[PDB]
Nucleic acid binder design. Sequence first.
RNA 1: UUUAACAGCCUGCCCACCCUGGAAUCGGCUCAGCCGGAGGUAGGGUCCAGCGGCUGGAAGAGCACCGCACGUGGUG
Length: 95
Amino acid sequence: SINNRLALVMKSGKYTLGYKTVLKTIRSSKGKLVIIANNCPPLRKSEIEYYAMLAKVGVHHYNGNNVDLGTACGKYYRVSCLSIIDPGDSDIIKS
RNA sequence: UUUAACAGCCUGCCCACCCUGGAAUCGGCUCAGCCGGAGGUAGGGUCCAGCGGCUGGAAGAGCACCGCACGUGGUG
Ligand SMILES: [K+]
Ligand SMILES: [Mg+2]
Ligand SMILES: [Mg+2]
Ligand SMILES: [Mg+2]
């Protein structure tokens, strides 16, 4: 899994959690990798992927729901999707 | 010791909704709940209810009281 690599970003890299900020980072091209939970709304999932394809940003489908993804990020709330701005330590390379 | 339908304007309950923004030292919140990265708090807006407010209707009416005549005037 990517929980170990994702944990490193939470303390050494730059990221935005949530659907509204993820679109913002894709619009400004600050996002380098987008991670989406498996229970994300199907329409929202397609919209994010279309945005990422338009901005030439890689998309990773997380193996877990928004509850699991939020826990992986070390947060006490659900996260449907997130964007990584600064990888920090070998997250965008091996994905 | 009063103020109808109706007409215009204002107000904008409890909710719902929109924009900005991005939250752990978690916070907001009800009598009770409960709500928030599926975007809270906060700031600024939109909409909805009315058996709500103002004016018109409408004081010319009604009521009370005091007169003059035996209808008519005044005050509130
Ligand atoms: K009526
Ligand atoms: Mg608000
Ligand atoms: Mg009046
Ligand atoms: Mg009168």
